[PDB]
């Protein structure tokens, strides 16, 4: 199989690359369209015509140990792609998947408070969302997970864990409960 | 038992690829206090003065500029030169910081010849249009290379050697887009610099210079594609601009006006091209990884005139660029700079002679 | 024409992280280095770092490396400065300078930014009188004045009689205590004969806590 | 880093007098030096750049020399507006400042007018007492103040501060504060501060007691 790495939208990710011996040697990071992203030319860095240009940038201090990371900050969903690190006649591949998750909560009179978590997943992927109520009430869901009416106990820290390619990424959401129904 | 024609017994030469520490020769002066002359005097030998080569008839030899251990040795020498020459005020390397005196010193590269020691020899390709990797069917032997100025720089190759016929392009792998395309011109283009912060280049001449290169590239990447030049795609200041030394001061020149052309796309000007330049006290190192800070410029009048004899390009490509190719200035690995001169050479080990058979 | 207008004073607790600005005008901002200097209360100047806005090349003094950060928003012609893990000895005035004429020295300066780092928070002063010992039967001149104790931070301006009495006035510099609160003291010498008739009023002003306090003194 | 060491730390001189302050770098820095003047309460002013080059709009009586490691700023006819604190500064890469050199005015030895102020009313209603000692208009700036409560000299609980040199009579003033408590002040009744200044023939003690109406 291929090395898969999951990342959160807005977060920063460090994709690793390591040579067989501890010394700075010509490396180069590309994507799946073989588009130059970032590499070195001796002790100088160079960036390719990609769209991660302003946001991708390894740091040189580690090159002398054979470490040639590709760091992407302020991740986007469009940053989901296979990135190949070419160093010394080897082409190590990695699958990057960037998920995002938003939370809308509308409370109405004569109704109560509703909650809708929406997952922004990368094009072509099968994610499985599993949100955990503060008290341990797990709920299944696909693209979006809804809760018609919250309760007083649901106030706290919800953990929603996204499952993709055998591994997972964890989201934390502090839920504030404005209104709950009660038998009068 | 003999017959008619006198049979001749030949002692044929025998050699083998090898590696050894070469020495060097220069026209350095023991009265010049500039760094190159000072270094050369301390580590080199007087010159030729009438160099000759031994042409080897009907001999074919394989070369590989991208794996020439002559380069590795020259690189170490030029590094070892700057160490004792250009003393920075601050040196940042590996979480370590150093401070020292930094005297301004005269700094102009002097041609160096790399010579084979006792026992070895240096084969040399005499084929004028030679890419540098493959069989040369016109070799010859030399004691020493030619005059190689240790010009450190990016984007443009300065004070170098011109191709003897047409413009030549060289790459370890034209397919791999991460690979540099060392270019050799058959006609030098003057770039006149000044401390006032700009650099002049003849527009019309540089225009044709690009048409030549373009045509050589269009040939390499299928005779049907449109050749476009663009500015550096980003990186360090020493890469993104035409970085180069000129009188002790490091110059960073904007080269966008050079590389904004579109060729073979069948659908008023300026007298000369003026490039925005600027010295910098804080520069990245080419020796190893790190930064260094230098003292402020001395006098305002800083003129340096050089010949653009070569280019370091890089191609963009990708599984999308069809019907056109994009090329941007590049460089950085000073070894490419060396390989643009040491491309036709090759050091070899000499051993006992072998006698020749007889066939007809 | 040319100018460097810094930000206002700021109070922080130990461990915090301050970030002051320095809006620049009168020249092309991105073409010149900018430097930062700090000066402890009544102590020598101390350089901190520089930066070339173009490439964001930065330099720091040893005493600040890995604890200070200098940036420069080129679009708004503004420079900033961050100081992580603040301590008690970081209490000083912070200047920013530049050199639009490239003399390799600081030609233009900012008005300054006072940064006070302590455990206590803004607290007004407690004023206690300092009346004359022996009056009109003793000497010819007797000392008098006010005492401004326990306050934070600086500054605090003191006058006398609404600006009328500025003769013999000696407003001592403040001092930091083991408690983390400054405490100065203003005095003034006058004829010991005019004590019984003249009334001396000192005018305090602790701008931090917006305090305005007047006080009378008496050897009655 | 590279150290900048200037001396003297302080120097007193009269008007018309000529003064020389020197700087010294631990490592060669060529002619890349700068001198600043700084008066209390304001931002420093560039005087000299490139070790010898005079800044525009600066009196000609200012001039610096030296090259490499040893430098010196020199003022010819010293002026009233020339009394301040001067700094040197490396200017080739790093910009380290020298310790500093204060050029104050020179005058005659003046005895200190010694005073003593007991804790007032309001200060006792808060449970914290502090005694003030005041040395008025004196010279030079050197003075040794000791606190003796009931003939028992203590140390550690007092804080003094000196004013800047008077613009008119060029003298100093110093106040020492003895901080104690609410109980340690009433358990005693005789406080004093011995003041040793060079303008005084013998040590002058100023004390007080129970106080009277
Ligand atoms: C190229 O430039 C050099 C100076 O670097 C100059 O002396 C020489 O005349 C030029 N060569 C040619 C071929 O014109
Ligand atoms: C090639 O070289 C041999 C010498 O080794 C020479 O005798 C022969 O004539 C040459 N071949 C040609 C081109 O005639
Ligand atoms: C080999 O090269 C030399 C020039 O270096 C040339 O004179 C000679 O004609 C060449 N030999 C052939 C026949 O290719
Ligand atoms: C030149 O390079 C090509 C590959 O680009 C190689 O096939 C050839 O053998 C080399 N030799 C020549 C013809 O110069
Ligand atoms: C190379 O230079 C010659 C002049 O020596 C010129 O005529 C020719 O066009 C150039 N060849 C190319 C197009 O590379
Ligand atoms: C040349 O480049 C192509 C494209 O990256 C690559 O597939 C091939 O392996 C390279 N050949 C060599 C000599 O490594
Ligand atoms: C000069 O260079 C910068 C980037 O280095 C580029 O953005 C700009 O377009 C260039 N200006 C000119 C002269 O075209
Ligand atoms: C390249 O750059 C110039 C300015 O330097 C710009 O005006 C021009 O449009 C560009 N050329 C092309 C081919 O678009
Ligand atoms: C050639 O010209 C057309 C417009 O006429 C332009 O769209 C194109 O980019 C140029 N070359 C290519 C890449 O086909
Ligand atoms: C190129 O050679 C000339 C010789 O006159 C010299 O002035 C110039 O500095 C050299 N250029 C570089 C890049 O050193």
| CATH code at position D119 | 2.60.40.10
Residues D142 and D52 in one domain: no
Residue C83: closest CA among C33, C53, C38: C38
B149 contacts B110 by C-beta, under 8 angstroms: yes
Entry resolution (Å): 2.6
Q: How far is the CA of B231 from the centre of ligand 8 (A)?
A: 11
Helix (H) or strand (E) segment spanning residue B213 = helix B203-220
Q: HSE of C132 in the Cβ direction (CA atoms, 13 Å)?
A: 27
End-of-domain residue from the set D63, D86, D106: D106
Q: Is B173 in the pocket of ligand 6 (CB under 6 A)?
A: yes
Q: How many CB atoms lie within 10 A of CB A90?
A: 12
Residues D32 and D75 in one domain: yes
- Classify B4 as helix, strand or coil: coil
Phi, psi of C162 (to 5 degrees): 60, 30
Residues D102 and D114 in one domain: no
Residues C201 and C126 in one domain: yes
**Virtual CA dihedral for A149, A152, A157, A158, nearest 10 degrees?**
-30
Number of domains forming the structure of chain C: 2
C118 contacts C91 by C-beta, under 8 angstroms: yes
Q: For the residues of B94-116, what is the DSSP string, one character each?
A: TTEEEE------------BEEE-
Q: For A100-174, which CATH superfamily applies?
A: Immunoglobulins (2.60.40.10)
Q: In the block, which residue shows the tokens 């013998």? A: D202
- Classify B292 as helix, strand or coil: strand
Q: How far is the CA of B74 from the centre of ligand 10 (A)?
A: 19
What residues have CB less than 8 Å from C36, skipping those under 6 apart? C47, C48, C49, C50, C70, C81, C94, C95, C96, C97
Pairwise CA distance, residues A61 & A47, whole Å: 17
What domain range includes position C111? Answer: 1-115
Which of D8, D31, D95 is the mutation pick for testing C, counting most C CBs within 10 A? D95
Residue C66: closest CA among C85, C90, C40: C85
Residue C21: closest CA among C102, C89, C115: C115
Going by their DSSP bridges, the two strands A3-8 and A90-104 should be labelled as parallel
The one-character DSSP state at B200 is E
Residues D147 and D205 in one domain: yes
Q: Which residues of A touch B (CB under 8 A)?
A: 24, 26, 28, 30, 33-36, 39-49, 53, 60-61, 63-64, 86
**Virtual CA dihedral for B49, B55, B56, B61, nearest 10 degrees?**
80
Choose which residue among B185, B188, B209, B307 to substitute to test ligand 1 binding: the one with the highest number of ligand atoms within 8 A of its C-beta: B307
Q: Is B175 in the pocket of ligand 6 (CB under 6 A)?
A: yes
Put simply, the answer to whether A33 touches B239 (Cβ < 8 Å) is no
- Classify C165 as helix, strand or coil: coil
Which of C57, C63, C99 is the mutation pick for testing B, counting most B CBs within 10 A? C57
Nearest CA owner, ligand 10 atom 1 = B306
- Token couple for C29: 């901002």
B79 contacts D6 by C-beta, under 8 angstroms: no
Residues D143 and D197 in one domain: yes
Residues C91 and C122 in one domain: no
Number of domains forming the structure of chain D: 2
Residues C1 and C101 in one domain: yes
| CB burial string C187-204: b at 16+ within 10 A, e below | bbbbebeebeeeebebbb
Instruction: Note the CATH architecture for domain B10-360.
Output: Beta Complex (2.170)
Residues C106 and C2 in one domain: yes
End-of-domain residue from the set D70, D90, D106: D106
Q: How many CB atoms lie within 10 A of CB C72?
A: 23
User: What separation in angstroms does the CA of C126 have from each of A73, A141, B190, B271, D121?
Assistant: 52, 64, 78, 77, 12
Q: Where in chain A is the domain with CATH 2.60.40.10?
A: 1-99, 100-174
Residue C88: closest CA among C9, C208, C179: C179
Q: Does B have 3 or more CB contacts under 8 Å with A?
A: yes
Q: In the block, which residue shows the tokens 């200060």? A: D123
Ligand index nearest the alpha carbon of residue B322: 9
Nearest CA owner, ligand 4 atom 6 = B134
Residues D102 and D118 in one domain: no
End-of-domain residue from the set D106, D132, D152: D106
Helix locations, D57-200, DSSP H: none
Residues C110 and C11 in one domain: yes
Q: Report the sign of the C-alpha dihedral through residues C119, C125, C128, C132, in that order.
A: positive
What domain range includes position D48? Answer: 1-106
Cis check for the bond before C116: say yes or no (omega within 30 of 0). no
Pairwise CA distance, residues D103 & D82, whole Å: 8
Pairwise CA distance, residues B147 & B51, whole Å: 12
End-of-domain residue from the set C87, C115, C143: C115
CA D188 to mean position of chain CA atoms: 34
A12 contacts A56 by C-beta, under 8 angstroms: no
- Token couple for D57: 């709009």
Pairwise CA distance, residues B327 & B313, whole Å: 6
Residue A143: closest CA among A110, A121, A161: A121
Pairwise CA distance, residues B25 & B49, whole Å: 11
User: Please, what is the Cα angle at C132 between C130 and C138, to 5 degrees?
Assistant: 165
For residue B260, the ligand 8 atom closest to its alpha carbon is 1
Long-range contacts, D198-206 (Cβ 8 Å, 24+): D198/D109, D198/D140, D198/D142, D199/D109, D199/D110, D199/D111, D199/D112, D199/D138, D199/D139, D200/D111, D200/D112, D204/D112, D204/D114, D205/D148, D206/D114, D206/D115, D206/D116, D206/D133
Helix axes B35-43, B69-84, angle to 10 degrees: 120
C79 contacts C94 by C-beta, under 8 angstroms: no
Pairwise CA distance, residues D9 & D86, whole Å: 10
User: Which residue from B minimizes the CA distance to A31?
Assistant: B318
End-of-domain residue from the set C115, C141, C156: C115
B282 contacts B293 by C-beta, under 8 angstroms: yes
Put simply, the answer to whether A42 touches B236 (Cβ < 8 Å) is no
Strand partners, A103: A117
Pairwise CA distance, residues B40 & B36, whole Å: 6
Which of D111, D175, D193 is the mutation pick for testing C, counting most C CBs within 10 A? D175
B296 contacts D50 by C-beta, under 8 angstroms: no
CATH fold for the domain made of A1-99? Immunoglobulin-like (2.60.40)
- Token couple for B205: 């001449």
Q: What CATH number has the domain bearing residue C1? A: 2.60.40.10
Pairwise CA distance, residues C199 & C217, whole Å: 7
Residue D98: closest CA among D22, D212, D189: D22
- Token couple for D23: 């700087």
User: What separation in angstroms does the CA of B352 have from each of B12, B116, D96?
Assistant: 9, 18, 67
End-of-domain residue from the set C59, C91, C115: C115
């Amino acid at each position: 199989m291929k090395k898969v790495v999951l990342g959160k939208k807005g977060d920063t990710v460090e994709l690793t690359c390591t040579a067989s011996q501890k010394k700075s040697i010509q490396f180069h990071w590309k994507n799946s369209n073989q588009i130059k992203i970032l590499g070195n030319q001796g002790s100088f860095l160079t960036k390719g015509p990609s769209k991660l240009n302003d946001r991708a940038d390894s740091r040189r201090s580690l090159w002398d140990q054979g470490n040639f990371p590709l760091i992407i900050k302020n991740l986007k969903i469009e940053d989901s792609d296979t990135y190949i690190c070419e160093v010394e006649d080897q082409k190590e591949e990695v699958q990057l998947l960037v998920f995002g998750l938003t939370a809308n909560s509308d409370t109405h009179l004569l109704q109560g408070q509703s909650l809708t978590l929406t997952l922004e997943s990368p094009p072509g992927s099968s994610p499985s969302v599993q949100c955990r109520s503060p008290r341990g009430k797990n709920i299944q869901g696909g693209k979006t997970l809804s809760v018609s009416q919250l309760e007083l106990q649901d106030s706290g820290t919800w953990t929603c864990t996204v499952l993709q390619n055998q591994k997972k990424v964890e989201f934390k959401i502090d839920i504030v409960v404005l209104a709950f129904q009660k038998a009068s | 038992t003999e017959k008619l024609w006198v049979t001749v017994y030949y002692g044929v030469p025998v050699w083998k690829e090898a590696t050894t520490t070469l020495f060097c020769a220069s026209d350095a002066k023991a009265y010049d206090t500039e760094v190159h002359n000072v270094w050369a005097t301390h580590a080199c030998v007087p010159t030729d003065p009438n160099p000759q080569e031994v042409v080897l008839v009907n001999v074919t030899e394989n070369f590989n500029m991208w794996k020439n251990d002559m380069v590795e040795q020259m690189h170490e020498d030029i590094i070892s030169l700057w160490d004792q020459s250009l003393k920075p005020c601050v040196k940042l390397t590996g979480g370590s910081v150093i401070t020292q005196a930094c005297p301004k010193v005269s700094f102009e590269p002097i041609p160096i010849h790399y010579c084979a020691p006792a026992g070895f020899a240096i084969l040399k390709c005499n084929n004028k249009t030679f890419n540098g990797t493959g069989p040369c069917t016109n070799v010859s032997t030399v004691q020493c290379t030619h005059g190689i100025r240790p010009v450190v720089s990016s984007q443009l190759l300065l004070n170098g050697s011109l191709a003897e016929e047409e413009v030549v392009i060289r790459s370890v792998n034209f397919t791999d887009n991460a690979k540099t395309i060392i270019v050799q011109l058959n006609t030098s283009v003057e770039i006149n610099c000044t401390g006032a912060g700009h650099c002049n280049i003849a527009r019309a001449k540089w225009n044709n210079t690009l048409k030549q290169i373009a045509s050589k590239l269009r040939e390499q990447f299928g005779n049907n594609k449109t050749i476009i030049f663009k500015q550096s795609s980003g990186g360090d200041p020493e890469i993104v601009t035409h970085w180069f030394n000129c009188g002790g001061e490091f110059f960073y020149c904007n080269s966008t006006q050079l590389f904004n052309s579109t060729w073979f796309n069948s659908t008023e000007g300026s007298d000369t091209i003026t490039l925005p330049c600027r010295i910098k006290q804080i520069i990245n190192m080419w020796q190893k990884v790190g930064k260094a800070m230098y003292a402020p410029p001395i006098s305002g009048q800083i003129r340096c005139s050089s010949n653009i004899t070569g280019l370091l390009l890089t191609r963009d490509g990708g599984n999308s660029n069809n019907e056109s190719e994009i090329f941007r200035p590049g460089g950085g690995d000073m070894r490419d700079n060396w390989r643009s001169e040491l491309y036709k050479y090759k050091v070899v080990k000499i051993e006992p002679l072998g006698v020749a058979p007889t066939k007809a | 024409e040319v100018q460097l207008v810094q930000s206002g004073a700021e109070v922080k607790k130990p461990g915090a992280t301050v970030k002051i600005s320095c809006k620049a005008s009168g020249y092309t901002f991105s073409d010149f280095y900018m430097y930062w200097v700090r000066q402890a209360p009544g102590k020598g100047l101390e350089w901190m770092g520089l930066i070339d806005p173009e490439d964001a090349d930065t330099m720091y003094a040893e005493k600040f490396r890995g604890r200070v950060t200098i940036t420069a928003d080129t679009s708004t012609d503004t420079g900033y400065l961050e100081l992580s893990s603040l301590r008690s000895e970081d209490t000083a005035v912070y200047y920013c300078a530049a050199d639009p004429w490239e003399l390799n020295a600081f030609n233009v300066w900012g008005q300054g930014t006072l940064v006070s780092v302590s455990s206590a928070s803004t607290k007004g002063p407690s004023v206690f009188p300092l009346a004359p010992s022996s009056k009109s039967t003793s000497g010819g001149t007797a000392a008098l004045g006010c005492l401004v104790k326990d306050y934070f931070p600086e500054p605090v301006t003191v006058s006398w009689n609404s600006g009328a009495l500025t003769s013999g006035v000696h407003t001592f510099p403040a001092v930091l205590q083991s408690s983390g609160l400054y405490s100065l003291s203003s005095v003034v010498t006058v004829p010991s004969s005019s004590l019984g008739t003249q009334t001396y009023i000192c005018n305090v002003n602790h701008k931090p806590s917006n305090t305005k306090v007047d006080k009378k003194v008496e050897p009655k | 880093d590279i150290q900048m060491t200037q001396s003297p730390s302080s120097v007193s001189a009269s008007v018309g007098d000529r003064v020389t302050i020197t700087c010294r770098a631990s490592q060669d820095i060529s002619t890349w030096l700068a001198w600043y003047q700084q008066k209390p309460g304001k931002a420093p002013k560039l005087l000299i750049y490139a070790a010898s080059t005079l800044q525009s709009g600066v009196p000609s009586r200012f001039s610096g020399s030296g090259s490499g490691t040893d430098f010196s700023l020199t003022i010819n006819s010293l002026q009233p507006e020339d009394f301040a604190t001067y700094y040197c500064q490396q200017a080739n890469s790093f910009f380290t400042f020298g310790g500093g050199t204060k050029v104050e005015i020179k005058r005659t030895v003046a005895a200190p007018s010694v005073f003593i102020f007991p804790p007032s009313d309001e200060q006792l209603k808060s449970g914290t007492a502090s005694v003030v000692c005041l040395l008025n208009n004196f010279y030079p700036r050197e003075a040794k103040v000791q606190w003796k409560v009931d003939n028992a000299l203590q140390s550690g609980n007092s804080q003094e501060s000196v004013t800047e040199q008077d613009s008119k009579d060029s003298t100093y003033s110093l106040s020492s504060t003895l901080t104690l408590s609410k109980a340690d002040y009433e358990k005693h009744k005789l406080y004093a501060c011995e003041v040793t200044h060079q303008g005084l023939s013998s040590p002058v003690t100023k004390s007080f007691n129970r106080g009277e109406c």
